[PDB]
XYZ file of C-alpha atoms in Angstrom:
762
model
C 9.396 -68.843 -15.970
C 9.072 -69.678 -19.566
C 7.218 -66.390 -20.130
C 9.928 -64.367 -18.334
C 12.596 -66.213 -20.316
C 10.963 -65.518 -23.646
C 10.526 -61.840 -22.963
C 14.201 -61.567 -21.800
C 15.392 -63.674 -24.842
C 13.303 -61.551 -27.249
C 14.138 -58.172 -25.796
C 18.018 -58.683 -25.285
C 18.362 -60.075 -28.828
C 19.528 -56.566 -29.955
C 22.077 -56.720 -27.096
C 25.484 -58.147 -28.010
C 25.540 -60.664 -25.198
C 27.964 -62.912 -27.235
C 31.055 -64.431 -25.672
C 32.639 -67.255 -27.633
C 35.171 -67.944 -24.891
C 32.472 -68.415 -22.147
C 32.902 -71.468 -20.127
C 29.854 -73.279 -18.827
C 30.148 -74.125 -15.277
C 29.896 -77.830 -14.039
C 26.838 -76.850 -11.835
C 24.947 -74.544 -14.071
C 22.231 -72.722 -11.982
C 19.332 -73.495 -14.169
C 15.992 -71.426 -13.535
C 14.340 -72.114 -16.879
C 13.819 -75.903 -16.945
C 13.763 -75.857 -20.719
C 17.175 -74.101 -20.897
C 19.569 -75.900 -23.189
C 22.002 -78.161 -21.535
C 24.993 -76.440 -22.951
C 23.887 -72.952 -22.656
C 25.580 -70.084 -24.437
C 26.530 -66.515 -22.949
C 23.254 -64.925 -23.971
C 21.161 -67.930 -22.608
C 22.988 -67.647 -19.315
C 22.369 -63.897 -19.194
C 18.668 -64.333 -19.716
C 18.505 -67.144 -17.140
C 20.207 -64.754 -14.555
C 17.505 -62.132 -15.640
C 14.788 -64.674 -14.739
C 16.546 -65.579 -11.466
C 16.863 -61.953 -10.462
C 13.045 -61.509 -10.886
C 12.159 -64.577 -8.832
C 14.560 -63.570 -5.804
C 12.101 -60.616 -5.372
C 9.290 -63.079 -4.736
C 11.190 -65.010 -1.978
C 12.414 -61.668 -0.667
C 8.832 -60.369 -0.387
C 7.914 -63.682 1.244
C 10.647 -63.400 3.838
C 9.432 -59.934 4.679
C 5.881 -61.134 5.018
C 6.904 -63.798 7.512
C 8.561 -61.277 9.581
C 5.434 -59.062 9.640
C 7.065 -56.603 7.212
C 5.349 -54.489 4.573
C 5.699 -55.702 1.004
C 4.990 -54.474 -2.451
C 3.665 -56.620 -5.265
C 6.170 -57.729 -7.782
C 4.626 -57.421 -11.210
C 5.756 -58.222 -14.755
C 6.248 -54.662 -15.277
C 9.045 -54.942 -12.890
C 10.697 -57.323 -15.204
C 10.055 -55.032 -18.197
C 11.700 -52.179 -16.477
C 14.756 -54.480 -15.407
C 15.308 -55.468 -19.126
C 14.673 -51.818 -20.162
C 17.341 -50.661 -17.813
C 19.651 -53.499 -18.625
C 19.572 -52.653 -22.364
C 19.926 -48.847 -21.772
C 22.872 -49.243 -19.266
C 24.612 -51.876 -21.684
C 24.337 -49.478 -24.595
C 25.538 -46.535 -22.515
C 28.365 -48.286 -20.922
C 29.775 -49.596 -24.275
C 29.407 -46.300 -25.897
C 31.269 -44.414 -23.005
C 34.020 -46.953 -22.794
C 34.628 -47.298 -26.532
C 34.631 -43.531 -26.718
C 37.178 -43.336 -23.822
C 39.301 -46.046 -25.559
C 39.299 -44.034 -28.719
C 40.258 -40.883 -27.081
C 43.116 -42.459 -25.161
C 44.611 -44.058 -28.245
C 44.483 -40.854 -30.036
C 46.265 -39.058 -27.181
C 48.821 -41.785 -26.923
C 49.376 -41.639 -30.711
C 49.859 -37.838 -30.560
C 52.503 -38.166 -27.813
C 54.366 -40.871 -29.849
C 54.400 -38.843 -32.837
C 55.664 -35.945 -30.868
C 58.535 -38.088 -29.446
C 59.370 -38.965 -33.154
C 59.171 -35.216 -34.030
C 61.681 -34.057 -31.323
C 63.998 -36.823 -32.318
C 64.055 -35.552 -35.870
C 63.851 -31.808 -35.029
C 66.979 -32.499 -32.763
C 68.692 -34.236 -35.807
C 67.564 -30.946 -37.786
C 69.369 -28.871 -35.153
C 72.594 -30.680 -35.592
C 72.415 -30.151 -39.351
C 71.629 -26.497 -38.915
C 74.722 -26.367 -36.676
C 76.805 -27.899 -39.354
C 75.433 -25.426 -41.842
C 76.290 -22.478 -39.598
C 79.912 -23.744 -39.224
C 80.168 -24.102 -42.915
C 78.664 -20.614 -43.474
C 80.955 -19.066 -40.901
C 84.109 -20.706 -42.202
C 83.259 -19.676 -45.790
C 82.591 -16.113 -44.644
C 85.821 -15.920 -42.770
C 87.851 -17.403 -45.685
C 86.324 -14.868 -48.224
C 86.786 -11.915 -45.874
C 90.549 -12.877 -45.222
C 91.121 -12.870 -49.020
C 79.835 -5.763 -49.750
C 78.617 -9.329 -50.626
C 80.374 -10.701 -47.556
C 78.213 -8.461 -45.425
C 75.181 -10.321 -46.903
C 76.733 -13.605 -46.355
C 77.333 -12.963 -42.575
C 73.888 -11.568 -42.428
C 72.420 -14.786 -43.726
C 74.470 -16.602 -41.186
C 73.188 -14.401 -38.480
C 69.670 -15.250 -39.740
C 70.466 -18.836 -39.469
C 71.884 -18.338 -36.074
C 68.589 -16.868 -34.946
C 66.666 -19.733 -36.567
C 68.840 -22.185 -34.731
C 68.201 -20.394 -31.525
C 64.503 -20.620 -32.145
C 64.875 -24.295 -32.972
C 66.908 -25.084 -29.839
C 64.535 -23.108 -27.734
C 61.690 -25.300 -29.158
C 63.698 -28.435 -28.280
C 64.084 -27.330 -24.618
C 60.472 -26.199 -24.221
C 58.939 -29.181 -25.954
C 61.259 -31.664 -23.987
C 59.882 -30.084 -20.819
C 56.276 -30.565 -22.078
C 56.976 -34.433 -22.728
C 58.523 -34.589 -19.165
C 55.282 -32.999 -17.719
C 53.225 -35.340 -19.955
C 55.107 -38.487 -18.807
C 52.731 -39.111 -16.025
C 49.718 -38.719 -18.291
C 51.060 -41.108 -20.789
C 51.801 -43.771 -18.141
C 48.172 -43.480 -16.784
C 46.577 -43.482 -20.189
C 48.611 -46.628 -21.190
C 47.547 -48.506 -17.983
C 43.876 -47.572 -18.801
C 44.318 -48.895 -22.394
C 45.659 -52.113 -20.985
C 42.640 -52.428 -18.625
C 40.205 -51.673 -21.491
C 39.762 -55.344 -22.425
C 39.158 -56.306 -18.753
C 36.465 -53.685 -18.638
C 34.750 -54.942 -21.864
C 34.425 -58.415 -20.223
C 32.511 -57.235 -17.199
C 29.901 -54.917 -18.880
C 27.257 -57.657 -19.159
C 27.569 -58.691 -15.537
C 27.841 -55.235 -14.116
C 24.992 -53.726 -16.115
C 22.637 -56.679 -15.061
C 23.410 -56.014 -11.347
C 23.020 -52.189 -11.879
C 19.789 -52.573 -13.677
C 18.230 -55.035 -11.193
C 19.112 -52.469 -8.374
C 17.231 -49.598 -9.999
C 14.198 -51.721 -11.095
C 13.667 -53.805 -7.886
C 15.611 -52.459 -4.774
C 13.944 -49.134 -4.644
C 11.371 -49.942 -2.049
C 13.618 -51.915 0.308
C 15.854 -50.679 3.030
C 19.492 -50.778 3.329
C 19.894 -54.151 4.561
C 17.525 -55.783 2.132
C 19.115 -53.908 -0.741
C 22.501 -55.407 0.129
C 21.004 -58.909 0.596
C 19.329 -58.831 -2.985
C 22.679 -57.555 -4.451
C 24.619 -60.188 -2.909
C 22.191 -62.988 -3.992
C 22.228 -61.676 -7.412
C 26.074 -61.379 -7.311
C 26.470 -65.003 -6.144
C 24.344 -66.410 -8.919
C 26.379 -64.620 -11.521
C 29.639 -66.237 -9.934
C 28.076 -69.628 -10.152
C 27.170 -69.031 -13.755
C 30.657 -67.810 -14.686
C 29.396 -64.437 -15.717
C 32.096 -61.914 -15.348
C 31.357 -58.714 -13.207
C 33.355 -56.339 -11.169
C 33.129 -56.357 -7.460
C 35.382 -53.387 -6.615
C 33.421 -50.453 -7.734
C 30.429 -49.362 -5.924
C 26.912 -49.267 -7.525
C 26.552 -45.417 -6.640
C 29.832 -44.781 -8.603
C 29.072 -47.228 -11.392
C 25.340 -45.626 -12.060
C 26.519 -41.908 -11.744
C 29.448 -39.713 -12.325
C 31.203 -37.294 -9.986
C 29.803 -34.148 -11.528
C 26.236 -35.355 -11.245
C 26.725 -36.222 -7.593
C 28.095 -32.752 -6.639
C 24.940 -31.115 -8.255
C 22.705 -33.507 -6.193
C 24.414 -32.403 -2.902
C 23.972 -28.709 -4.032
C 20.086 -29.754 -4.351
C 20.046 -30.542 -0.633
C 20.423 -34.332 -1.220
C 21.718 -35.915 2.068
C 25.332 -37.376 1.777
C 24.414 -40.994 1.994
C 24.810 -44.141 -0.154
C 21.055 -45.116 0.107
C 20.250 -41.364 -0.740
C 22.680 -41.529 -3.637
C 21.047 -44.799 -4.792
C 17.605 -43.054 -4.507
C 18.882 -39.976 -6.456
C 20.045 -42.379 -9.224
C 16.683 -44.010 -9.483
C 14.948 -40.661 -9.696
C 17.178 -40.136 -12.750
C 17.178 -43.455 -14.664
C 13.476 -44.449 -13.954
C 11.443 -46.156 -16.501
C 8.101 -45.929 -14.614
C 7.203 -42.791 -12.889
C 8.648 -42.675 -9.309
C 6.698 -42.851 -6.052
C 8.846 -41.121 -3.439
C 8.556 -42.302 0.286
C 10.200 -39.632 2.503
C 8.634 -38.963 5.802
C 11.243 -36.302 6.494
C 10.385 -34.491 3.214
C 14.007 -33.962 2.264
C 13.530 -35.865 -1.086
C 10.584 -33.602 -1.861
C 12.901 -30.405 -1.501
C 15.510 -32.158 -3.536
C 13.140 -33.011 -6.379
C 11.929 -29.306 -6.453
C 15.586 -27.930 -6.229
C 16.663 -30.380 -9.093
C 13.730 -29.349 -11.427
C 13.560 -25.761 -10.383
C 14.958 -24.445 -13.626
C 12.432 -26.605 -15.607
C 9.557 -24.926 -13.786
C 8.339 -27.863 -11.498
C 5.095 -27.335 -9.763
C 3.970 -28.882 -6.456
C 0.361 -30.151 -6.161
C -1.662 -32.615 -4.199
C -4.278 -35.199 -5.084
C -6.557 -33.578 -2.583
C -6.257 -30.118 -4.225
C -9.213 -29.209 -6.419
C -6.785 -27.661 -8.802
C -4.997 -31.047 -9.393
C -6.847 -31.852 -12.665
C -5.976 -28.177 -14.036
C -2.175 -28.432 -12.845
C -2.020 -31.977 -14.406
C -3.590 -30.860 -17.741
C -0.995 -28.084 -17.924
C 2.047 -30.314 -17.156
C 0.929 -32.785 -19.773
C 0.212 -30.126 -22.319
C 3.290 -27.926 -21.754
C 5.645 -30.713 -20.782
C 6.468 -29.340 -17.369
C 7.593 -31.554 -14.457
C 4.937 -32.074 -11.968
C 5.227 -33.319 -8.201
C 2.094 -34.696 -6.647
C 1.897 -35.250 -2.912
C -0.613 -37.376 -0.809
C -0.356 -40.407 -3.160
C -2.164 -42.387 -0.593
C -5.221 -40.635 -1.940
C -4.326 -41.580 -5.501
C -6.571 -40.304 -8.322
C -7.443 -43.008 -10.790
C -7.450 -40.226 -13.572
C -3.566 -40.730 -13.680
C -3.888 -44.352 -14.747
C -3.569 -43.685 -18.565
C -0.631 -41.236 -17.776
C 1.302 -43.762 -15.587
C 0.676 -46.528 -18.221
C 1.890 -44.155 -20.905
C -1.179 -45.151 -23.179
C -0.702 -42.716 -25.821
C -2.244 -42.639 -29.463
C 0.009 -41.313 -32.307
C -2.701 -40.273 -34.925
C -2.295 -37.587 -37.503
C 1.080 -36.302 -36.117
C -0.395 -35.733 -32.726
C 0.565 -37.775 -29.505
C -2.664 -37.887 -27.599
C -3.188 -38.899 -24.032
C -6.827 -39.602 -22.870
C -6.960 -37.945 -19.558
C -10.538 -38.370 -18.208
C -12.910 -37.601 -21.041
C -10.512 -35.220 -22.788
C -7.690 -35.736 -25.217
C -4.702 -33.707 -24.552
C -1.486 -33.173 -26.721
C 1.311 -34.844 -24.611
C 4.602 -33.152 -24.729
C 7.719 -35.449 -24.710
C 9.338 -33.404 -21.806
C 6.522 -34.221 -19.349
C 7.508 -35.931 -16.031
C 5.548 -36.669 -12.890
C 6.789 -37.473 -9.478
C 4.525 -39.014 -6.827
C 5.416 -38.470 -3.171
C 4.140 -39.528 0.276
C 5.212 -38.681 3.852
C 3.753 -42.050 5.385
C 6.261 -45.030 5.287
C 3.375 -47.318 6.675
C 1.004 -46.614 3.858
C -0.273 -49.627 1.826
C -0.727 -49.555 -1.995
C -2.979 -51.580 -4.246
C -1.116 -54.024 -6.454
C -2.179 -51.966 -9.709
C -0.612 -48.765 -8.459
C 2.604 -50.749 -7.380
C 2.958 -51.903 -11.026
C 2.376 -48.375 -12.526
C 5.211 -46.759 -10.477
C 8.645 -47.323 -9.263
C 9.208 -46.976 -5.662
C 12.061 -44.779 -4.116
C 12.060 -45.152 -0.399
C 13.960 -42.657 1.528
C 14.703 -44.623 4.670
C 17.010 -43.584 7.461
C 20.155 -45.663 7.914
C 22.235 -46.046 10.932
C 25.458 -44.563 9.222
C 23.447 -41.493 7.882
C 22.066 -40.677 11.280
C 25.446 -41.125 12.917
C 26.952 -38.505 10.494
C 24.023 -36.081 11.232
C 24.348 -36.412 14.917
C 28.206 -36.270 14.784
C 27.960 -33.000 12.684
C 25.278 -31.550 15.099
C 27.344 -32.190 18.220
C 30.304 -30.875 16.386
C 28.608 -27.553 15.498
C 27.168 -27.318 19.199
C 30.329 -28.158 20.940
C 33.130 -26.964 18.562
C 31.748 -24.319 16.123
C 35.194 -23.243 15.074
C 35.854 -26.946 13.990
C 32.516 -27.492 12.302
C 32.951 -24.430 10.095
C 36.587 -25.385 9.459
C 35.306 -28.802 8.433
C 32.407 -27.408 6.264
C 34.880 -25.219 4.461
C 37.222 -27.982 3.809
C 34.482 -30.153 2.231
C 33.639 -27.179 -0.174
C 37.347 -26.726 -1.012
C 37.929 -30.426 -1.777
C 34.794 -30.543 -3.828
C 35.854 -27.600 -5.889
C 39.413 -29.006 -6.186
C 38.286 -32.444 -7.408
C 35.956 -30.737 -9.872
C 38.838 -28.644 -11.199
C 41.018 -31.826 -11.573
C 38.304 -33.456 -13.747
C 38.005 -30.403 -15.973
C 41.878 -30.084 -16.324
C 42.053 -33.931 -17.056
C 39.154 -33.700 -19.555
C 40.593 -30.489 -21.168
C 44.088 -32.030 -21.442
C 42.568 -35.135 -23.126
C 40.141 -33.151 -25.413
C 43.008 -30.807 -26.493
C 45.282 -33.576 -27.709
C 42.533 -35.255 -29.652
C 41.376 -32.081 -31.500
C 44.822 -31.167 -32.771
C 45.183 -31.801 -36.394
C 48.938 -32.494 -37.303
C 51.306 -32.427 -34.342
C 51.425 -30.618 -31.049
C 54.763 -28.859 -31.918
C 53.299 -27.371 -35.199
C 51.239 -24.893 -33.439
C 52.634 -22.904 -30.416
C 49.117 -22.335 -28.781
C 48.833 -26.049 -28.152
C 52.125 -26.164 -26.298
C 50.849 -23.137 -24.327
C 47.598 -24.704 -23.418
C 49.171 -28.163 -22.549
C 51.649 -26.538 -20.184
C 49.116 -24.194 -18.649
C 46.630 -27.246 -17.989
C 49.575 -29.297 -16.514
C 50.772 -26.436 -14.214
C 47.178 -25.696 -12.915
C 46.769 -29.444 -12.285
C 50.031 -29.549 -10.122
C 48.770 -26.242 -8.139
C 45.392 -27.952 -7.543
C 47.043 -31.146 -6.621
C 49.248 -29.434 -4.082
C 46.096 -27.706 -2.785
C 44.548 -31.143 -2.371
C 47.438 -32.335 -0.392
C 47.216 -29.264 1.958
C 43.558 -29.656 2.649
C 43.838 -33.399 3.392
C 46.261 -32.675 6.296
C 44.025 -30.001 7.692
C 41.158 -32.493 7.206
C 43.217 -35.008 9.210
C 43.386 -32.720 12.294
C 39.664 -32.000 11.966
C 39.064 -35.868 12.120
C 40.985 -36.159 15.399
C 38.685 -33.647 17.068
C 35.489 -35.642 15.841
C 36.858 -38.903 17.090
C 35.986 -37.951 20.581
C 32.401 -37.245 19.728
C 32.099 -40.451 17.640
C 30.774 -42.647 20.562
C 27.887 -40.195 21.249
C 26.759 -40.314 17.602
C 26.660 -44.094 17.844
C 24.580 -44.034 20.973
C 22.234 -41.435 19.115
C 21.733 -43.943 16.279
C 21.074 -46.825 18.631
C 18.758 -44.761 20.795
C 16.495 -43.729 17.714
C 16.433 -47.113 16.285
C 15.064 -48.387 19.524
C 12.348 -45.697 19.219
C 11.775 -46.605 15.793
C 11.235 -50.299 16.583
C 8.997 -49.535 19.594
C 6.000 -49.729 17.219
C 6.443 -53.539 17.377
C 5.199 -53.862 20.972
C 2.248 -51.338 20.625
C 0.743 -49.617 17.711
C 0.587 -46.172 19.555
C 4.474 -45.935 19.828
C 4.939 -44.127 16.616
C 7.891 -41.768 16.670
C 9.323 -39.717 13.765
C 12.840 -38.753 13.105
C 11.990 -35.258 13.966
C 11.043 -36.238 17.538
C 14.452 -37.725 18.197
C 16.086 -34.616 16.734
C 14.099 -32.354 19.133
C 15.508 -34.621 21.871
C 19.043 -34.299 20.636
C 18.673 -30.474 20.071
C 17.317 -29.995 23.560
C 20.200 -32.081 25.157
C 22.770 -30.312 23.054
C 21.711 -26.652 23.521
C 18.800 -26.562 26.191
C 20.862 -28.465 28.719
C 20.655 -27.029 32.279
C 23.558 -29.261 33.380
C 25.736 -27.596 30.623
C 25.218 -24.167 32.266
C 28.727 -23.005 33.087
C 30.856 -26.008 32.186
C 33.858 -25.210 30.099
C 35.760 -28.467 29.818
C 34.921 -30.341 26.554
C 35.354 -33.831 28.060
C 33.059 -32.850 31.111
C 30.441 -31.367 28.673
C 30.512 -34.375 26.466
C 29.917 -36.725 29.514
C 27.019 -34.462 30.607
C 25.461 -34.597 27.111
C 25.738 -38.254 26.913
C 24.258 -38.784 30.373
C 21.366 -36.380 29.606
C 20.711 -37.911 26.055
C 19.540 -41.011 27.748
C 17.458 -39.323 30.407
C 15.723 -36.801 28.028
C 14.881 -39.638 25.512
C 13.433 -41.729 28.234
C 11.354 -38.776 29.742
C 9.888 -37.768 26.401
C 9.131 -41.200 25.124
C 7.798 -42.661 28.350
C 5.459 -39.773 28.679
C 3.466 -41.408 25.757
C 3.886 -45.051 26.788
C 1.901 -47.233 28.963
C 3.578 -47.845 32.452
C 3.720 -51.416 31.809
C 6.106 -50.586 28.871
C 8.249 -48.067 30.796
C 10.580 -50.722 32.180
C 10.937 -52.324 28.692
C 12.322 -49.173 27.152
C 14.569 -48.615 30.153
C 16.110 -52.105 29.990
C 17.055 -51.438 26.428
C 18.337 -47.963 27.016
C 20.533 -49.563 29.735
C 21.770 -52.095 27.260
C 22.749 -49.407 24.841
C 24.741 -47.668 27.595
C 26.314 -50.902 28.570
C 27.397 -51.467 25.004
C 29.074 -47.976 24.937
C 30.670 -48.390 28.493
C 34.490 -48.644 28.758
C 35.583 -51.782 30.945
C 32.432 -53.852 30.620
C 32.235 -57.280 28.889
C 29.714 -57.852 26.133
C 27.466 -60.001 28.403
C 26.036 -61.260 25.083
C 25.778 -64.780 26.442
C 24.053 -63.747 29.674
C 21.543 -61.520 27.941
C 21.015 -64.453 25.442
C 19.754 -66.832 28.142
C 18.021 -63.873 29.806
C 15.727 -63.357 26.657
C 15.591 -66.842 25.017
C 16.461 -69.081 27.949
C 13.176 -70.902 27.937
C 13.631 -72.475 24.564
C 16.308 -74.941 25.712
C 15.263 -78.372 25.143
C 15.066 -80.562 28.237
C 14.187 -84.121 28.722
C 12.136 -85.636 31.418
C 15.028 -87.591 32.887
C 17.515 -84.873 32.220
C 15.931 -82.477 35.024
C 16.487 -83.777 38.496
C 14.170 -83.262 41.483
C 16.065 -80.803 43.901
C 14.412 -80.793 47.368
C 12.806 -77.437 48.135
C 12.360 -76.300 44.537
C 9.249 -76.455 42.393
C 9.030 -78.407 39.162
C 9.215 -75.131 37.018
C 11.827 -73.755 39.381
C 14.091 -76.957 39.035
C 13.545 -76.783 35.115
C 14.762 -73.066 35.279
C 17.835 -74.219 37.283
C 18.883 -76.828 34.744
C 18.341 -74.369 31.943
C 20.393 -71.731 33.950
C 23.010 -74.458 34.497
C 24.121 -74.210 30.854
C 26.041 -71.051 31.389
C 29.608 -71.720 32.611
C 29.191 -69.406 35.521
C 26.118 -71.400 36.749
C 27.533 -74.792 35.964
C 27.718 -75.803 39.539
C 24.541 -73.945 40.517
C 22.750 -77.223 41.787
C 25.452 -78.055 44.179
C 25.454 -74.400 45.478
C 21.945 -74.330 46.050
C 21.763 -77.621 47.823
C 24.833 -76.636 50.042
C 23.033 -73.434 51.158
C 20.925 -74.008 54.175
C 19.545 -70.408 54.102
C 18.230 -70.800 50.519
C 14.836 -71.634 51.836
C 14.833 -68.466 53.785
C 15.692 -66.460 50.687
C 13.216 -68.458 48.409
C 10.163 -67.241 50.497
C 11.482 -63.897 51.368
C 9.282 -60.777 50.661
C 11.971 -59.013 48.549
C 14.440 -61.684 47.363
C 15.770 -59.300 44.734
C 17.599 -57.169 47.302
C 19.424 -60.047 48.938
C 20.220 -62.246 45.841
C 22.911 -64.885 47.092
C 26.339 -65.304 45.424
C 25.590 -68.497 43.561
C 27.689 -68.042 40.666
C 31.480 -68.696 40.174
C 33.880 -66.187 38.477
C 37.584 -66.225 37.966
C 37.738 -62.266 38.557
C 35.711 -59.990 40.599
C 32.860 -58.938 38.383
C 31.796 -55.363 37.936
C 28.557 -54.010 39.607
C 26.822 -54.169 36.337
C 27.888 -57.670 35.907
C 26.708 -58.681 39.261
C 23.260 -57.091 38.514
C 22.972 -59.223 35.416
C 23.891 -62.469 37.295
C 21.390 -61.521 39.971
C 18.818 -60.740 37.209
C 19.273 -64.274 35.958
C 19.050 -65.743 39.257
C 15.753 -63.878 40.086
C 14.292 -65.093 36.724
C 15.148 -68.753 37.470
C 13.924 -68.807 41.097
C 11.461 -65.916 41.704
C 9.830 -64.784 38.347
C 7.264 -62.658 40.268
C 10.299 -60.365 41.282
C 11.818 -60.115 37.879
C 10.271 -56.525 37.317
C 11.647 -55.495 40.757
C 15.186 -56.816 39.774
C 14.928 -55.102 36.305
C 14.479 -51.777 37.942
C 17.601 -52.421 40.033
C 19.521 -53.220 36.881
C 18.416 -49.869 35.272
C 19.809 -48.063 38.512
C 23.119 -49.771 38.164
C 23.611 -48.455 34.656
C 21.483 -45.335 34.247
C 21.226 -44.263 37.987
C 18.785 -44.563 40.852
C 16.694 -41.590 39.717
C 16.712 -42.466 36.035
C 12.813 -43.408 36.096
C 11.801 -41.396 39.118
C 10.382 -38.586 36.966
C 7.669 -40.966 35.753
C 6.154 -41.226 39.295
C 5.416 -37.505 39.452
C 2.439 -35.707 38.040
C 2.595 -34.642 34.466
C 3.773 -30.932 34.135
C 1.842 -29.900 31.168
C 2.678 -26.211 31.663
C 6.351 -26.675 31.010
C 6.043 -29.185 28.104
C 3.490 -27.278 26.275
C 4.916 -23.893 26.567
C 8.496 -24.883 25.742
C 8.888 -28.515 24.359
C 5.866 -28.381 22.018
C 5.937 -26.472 18.792
C 2.745 -24.798 17.610
C 2.775 -26.862 14.413
C 2.864 -30.013 16.455
C -0.467 -31.334 17.842
C -0.603 -32.366 21.327
C -2.239 -35.688 21.697
C -4.294 -36.513 24.877
C -4.364 -40.250 24.424
C -6.017 -41.948 27.490
C -6.911 -45.457 28.501
C -10.672 -46.094 28.777
C -12.251 -44.442 31.683
C -9.893 -41.594 31.828
C -10.452 -38.209 30.063
C -7.521 -35.797 29.568
C -9.620 -32.950 28.326
C -10.397 -31.751 31.906
C -6.640 -31.030 32.388
C -6.598 -28.832 29.266
C -9.229 -26.398 30.529
C -7.403 -26.356 33.856
C -4.022 -25.768 32.153
C -5.586 -23.046 30.020
C -7.262 -21.388 32.982
C -3.902 -21.181 34.867
C -2.127 -19.470 31.810
C -5.058 -17.185 31.148
C -5.337 -18.468 27.632
C -8.776 -18.566 26.024
C -9.372 -21.931 24.476
């Protein structure tokens, strides 16, 4: 902690970090034990910097306890954090000071113009008085050759006054048009002081996000940010909580170029794109889908980026050319990392005799300052040694629930309502162009006022430019309004398909977490997309159906069926029911008219952890000790509060207890104020079976699936596998077909028979 504090104190010395009005909180969160008791603003900032680094250690520890993959936290992470904190602080102060100077000049120019029109209106009155004097003098002289010249001079003044009064009206319109701009710029100038105070806190959070939260997923990224934010609140360090980190670390123009480079429209993807720009250590990209790899190539296409791999024999030649010529390089298969990159990643360069030399292998290469390298991998499950983790910054392109919901909502919209999807896609493009035009017009309006020397009214072209920029802004603003209302009608169409997208995200994340129960249950995002594509388009049920509501219900029903059929074909039969139960829960959460059943399912899964005393559990006649203990545990639920009385009062309970199939005739032993739904009855019977006859729990579980997903939901798994249909249609040539078999079974013999039937040489 002392080492971290000293490094932060030394590096942030050049930073301002000075706040004479800073108030020390009563409970100062102290991380450095030797921190002065009355700390200053700078010492509080460095203390927060040390705290941020340590929270990554506990975050890794928490992930380790949950069996989660972790990356080593090294002092190079701390160095990157303070490097980013210094760079962001200087950039934010420079931009906001420049913005304040621009606004003050623009406000000053308007105020001077307001003074100019006041005096120029006064000049108009004097000129009118001069015209009256000249006209009266000319009339008096005429009423008594030279008089023709006198009236000619008066006519010239009349034209000059006409130009002046035309300048009065035209300028007054310009000030009226610029009234809104003056009001907005004045408000921003008032908020300038507020923005100054929060630079230190905002930059600390932004720098920590780039340096640390790259590898973690969305939930952990939010957890780290909140923990950092709370510490700053307890330390009385000002920071803004209204702006998003994606908007604070990047501008709108850069974000538009990112989506043009095939970057997915997501907050996590935007954060990952920010890290790929402001990185200090060379990034290591983790994207199983490969979309980040395409985004990197598109972003650096103009700079002649090259794709290579560690396995390629030409990697050394490609790396040498990139270092020598300063070209961007993208290296894949980083799980086979070549230690030849160690000096390059560590930036160990020698500046001798005017040459920047990098020692690659046994050769010294002139390193160009424009060189940049990106490491990529398609395996999210890969381990990395601690030295590699210190040399690179991780940029994990995980899939979030919100991102998948948007993808599935767009996919069903394109399949079901192609006219709405193309109308929506065009509207997004139009709004993106309109907002870009507004920024250019606002920037041009501000830049034009600053560059004028003298006054606006002195030169006519400035008045023309200001009016043209304002009228174009109004036309674009009206276009923005009209696209929004057309956007609103598009949303109403997509609201109907919204529940389907939620089910798709829930289904896939169930598949993703299926790896916890068995190592073999590895499913990629593309596997789910093939299921979704097959349901949406290759749906026999949607053969001649024309109603949109009927087609949506068919798609929702077939989405669960096809997902089970494909996944369970590569699962052990003992795990088939487990996947079906969770699929039923997903359908239950999206069913209209069904209670949450959270309490019932809570006791179904963790009902055995209830603490029971020896004297608390009575001895009910006809029930075994473990059976009696289950009844007491089941008695905690309100619906089973009087379960013991009902069991004792039932003389036929002994017949049901030893019955061959008790799950089919479960007695009504629960009390409800209203008639429960058939699903609700199944859950209560499921709880009763678990308490009394645990051997029949699996049989009752299948009945529960039949209540939700239908009787024939799992019936397809009892038929022999149809390899002809799946291989011919549902299997792409690029996708290998895995014959996984339990010991004692060999699936190759099916393959020759399958090939023989199709007359395909193998």
